[PDB]
């Protein structure tokens, strides 16, 4: 029929695309990086362990100055720590206990948190009275919230749970532009340093590249066996790492739209939760539910030291902007700061 | 001892915040939590109505010096595999199944009967890997239609193997056994199988008896004797 022939054109185009992707690759990245040496064997010890939560921990985002951080937990509490002295600057009681994401504005005034309630709550921090208030309540998603990030004090990008990712304006709760291309729920997203493009990772084993102004998906990448649970960017805005549940991690390049080194081990059998880079993009720290945190080498697929101090699984991790710390949060209520 | 004035004030704020946080946690710790997996848009709603007298909707009732919190996840329309791990410490799972649900059209497939997908959803949670210790209660709801409908059509339409003669008691026993057999870990958890109705306000009391039993037996195992 007209539909049958449309699927035929679709499969023809699917093959035609793979033509060029193969036609571009000349030699593997692991073939070029034979020359450089091992990076070392990095062992870094825990410096501060801070304990105030009474449940699991599901999110953690560092500030814009590498001194303040915010942690979300199952009981309705969203603390705002101070990493140097390990005090507690603030403590926010929530409206719904069930939470799955936090976020810290790049200026320093706002903080966001949203979970299974389907709503995203923006919290004002510097007010005349002296208590933290709820400024807006953003509604419009039909599912749960996976990850929300800030562009400035007035715009925010939220990765839903049905199929969508939307861009908001804060003063008027209405949403401006909605990105609808996926086939399964979205789990994580990372923003580019230029702040014009962003990526998202679904549960149909895919990652896409969007355009924050135009509203179309320019590139789509494949090459996994199961869902993707984390995505980060290279400090240079040209490559992004992707975690998964098939125990592997992978590095993709936007200018080529190929795949690259596959940081897999034969002993690992479990999936991963979070993924980040370091300054200059030489290391790729990952978190595993085998109660571990492994450190790969972004240039040669070889492993380096590992970080093990946790009783239960690791849920989120992140590095700073000065590069002097990495923090990891577990289902055991504790949260640790590494060096 | 090298701290300044503002540092001492800063740590005083932290000590007070921590104390307040611990108190609130203790307050919330002594309050039983429940989960309500409907497994069908028809049966569930009545029970929450009788007990009271977007996404998650939570209800809060009291009975005989014990505070309850119920969570419902009816409308989510998402893969359950991703968010089900949030409910690990719940004391019980209230489950609802209809009786008139047999000989229904299913509105989508017209090849499968409703009670079969009910059984599949039952298995999925009774044998899940997080819910091994957590108990279950079955509130088989719409009997008022069952007594009327049993005589017109037998239970053989929805079941190949025989259910005996067609009388309310035998059919109720058979539908109950089909579910009760489904648990594999027969030594860890238990099922409580009430035959509820649309009246008489005993349905709130059955839950109190059940949850009391589960708390006391769990403590008995936690300390020695059992």
């Amino acid at each position: 029929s007209e539909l049958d022939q449309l699927r035929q054109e679709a499969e023809q185009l699917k093959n035609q695309i793979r033509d060029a992707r193969k036609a571009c690759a000349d030699a593997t990245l692991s073939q070029i990086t034979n020359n450089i040496d091992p990076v070392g064997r990095i062992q870094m010890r825990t410096r501060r362990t801070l304990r105030g939560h009474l449940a699991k921990i599901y999110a953690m985002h560092w500030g814009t100055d590498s001194r303040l951080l915010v942690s979300a937990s199952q009981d309705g509490k969203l603390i705002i720590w101070d990493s140097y002295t390990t005090n507690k600057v603030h403590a926010i009681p929530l409206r719904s206990s069930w939470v799955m994401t936090c976020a810290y504005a790049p200026s320093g005034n706002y903080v966001a948190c949203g979970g299974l309630d389907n709503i995203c709550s923006i919290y004002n921090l510097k007010t005349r009275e002296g208590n933290v208030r709820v400024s807006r309540e953003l509604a419009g998603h039909t599912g749960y919230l996976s990850c929300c990030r800030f562009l400035d004090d007035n715009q925010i990008v939220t990765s839903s749970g049905d199929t969508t990712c939307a861009l908001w304006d804060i003063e008027t709760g209405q949403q401006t532009t909605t990105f609808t291309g996926h086939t399964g729920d979205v789990m994580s997203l990372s923003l580019a340093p230029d702040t014009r493009l962003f990526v998202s990772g679904a549960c149909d084993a895919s990652a896409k590249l969007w355009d924050v102004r135009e509203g179309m998906c320019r590139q789509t990448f494949t090459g996994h066996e199961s869902d993707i649970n984390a995505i980060c960017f290279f400090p240079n805005g040209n490559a992004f790492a992707t975690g998964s549940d098939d125990a592997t991690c992978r590095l993709f390049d936007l200018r080529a739209d190929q795949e690259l080194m596959t940081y897999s081990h034969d002993n690992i059998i479990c999936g991963i939760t979070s993924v980040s880079f370091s300054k200059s993009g030489r290391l790729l720290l990952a978190g595993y539910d085998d109660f571990n945190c492994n450190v790969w080498d972004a240039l040669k697929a070889d492993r380096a030291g590992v970080l093990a101090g946790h009783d239960n699984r690791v849920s989120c991790l992140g590095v700073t902007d000065d590069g002097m710390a990495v923090a990891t949060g577990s289902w055991d209520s504790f949260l640790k700061i590494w060096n | 001892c090298t701290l300044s004035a503002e540092d001492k004030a800063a740590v005083e704020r932290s000590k007070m915040i921590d104390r307040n946080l611990r108190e609130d946690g203790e307050k919330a710790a002594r309050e039983v939590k429940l989960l309500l997996l409907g497994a069908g848009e028809s049966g569930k709603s009545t029970i929450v109505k009788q007990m009271k007298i977007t996404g998650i909707v939570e209800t809060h009732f009291t009975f005989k010096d014990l505070h309850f919190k119920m969570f419902d996840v009816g409308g989510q329309r998402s893969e359950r595999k991703k968010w089900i791990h949030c409910f690990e410490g719940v004391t019980a799972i209230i489950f609802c199944v209809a009786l008139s649900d047999y000989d229904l059209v299913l509105a989508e497939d017209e090849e499968m009967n409703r009670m079969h997908e009910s059984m599949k959803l039952f298995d999925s949670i009774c044998n899940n890997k997080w819910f091994t210790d957590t108990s279950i209660i079955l509130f088989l709801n719409k009997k008022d239609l069952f007594e009327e409908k049993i005589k017109k059509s037998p239970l053989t339409i929805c079941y190949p193997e025989y259910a005996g003669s067609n009388t309310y008691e035998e059919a109720a026993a058979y539908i109950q056994c089909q579910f009760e057999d489904l648990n594999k870990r027969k030594d860890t958890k238990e099922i409580y199988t009430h035959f509820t109705c649309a009246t008489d306000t005993k349905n709130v009391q059955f839950v109190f008896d059940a949850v009391t039993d589960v708390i006391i037996k769990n403590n008995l195992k936690d300390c020695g004797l059992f």
Partner: single-chain antibody
Amino acid sequence: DVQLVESGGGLVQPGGSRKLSCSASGFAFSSFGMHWVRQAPEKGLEWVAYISSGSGTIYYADTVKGRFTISRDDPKNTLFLQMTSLRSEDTAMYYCVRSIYYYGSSPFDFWGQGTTLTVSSSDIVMTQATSSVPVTPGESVSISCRSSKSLLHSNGNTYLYWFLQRPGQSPQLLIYRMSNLASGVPDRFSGSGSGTAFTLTISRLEAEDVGVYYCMQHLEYPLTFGAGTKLELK
């Protein structure tokens, strides 16, 4: 609004006692810690008492170590101060203030409206060498302040708060730790200091800048205010 108001006053012969009360209006009184400052007829300020959040630490000044007592009532939103044996050197306004202490916090934001009291008939001294200035409108002018001990600390930040007071009002907070700037204050003023010699420079002189200017320190606890520096329009 952050409105704060004080009450009690009148004349009391030596040895008598009175009591002062302050009522707060809508700023979450329980979290803040309050102080009590003073002002003789035509003189500088000085710091009389203190009480924290939680009625924990209590601190007093030297002259009033034994005569005065301070207390707070968490519900009902009021602050009290009771003076038992009264001498003749306490005829002054009494000016409540507020203060919240955390990482980025700005102490001494708000200031009361004051009362009056007429009876009958180590420390870090800070100088503010100049007394008065012939300042003319439209030109930049600067004010000096100094100290005995270096106010810098091992943490990394100094402690020098500048204030401003127009004739017939209550003080405002301008720049809290040197080179910061308080909310709602125009962008003209500047911190610009280091070690043990601090200054303050304003770009243009509008008419409102007339008044007195004080400098406070906040490292060690008996808190010393400087004298005045007056800016005369001419």
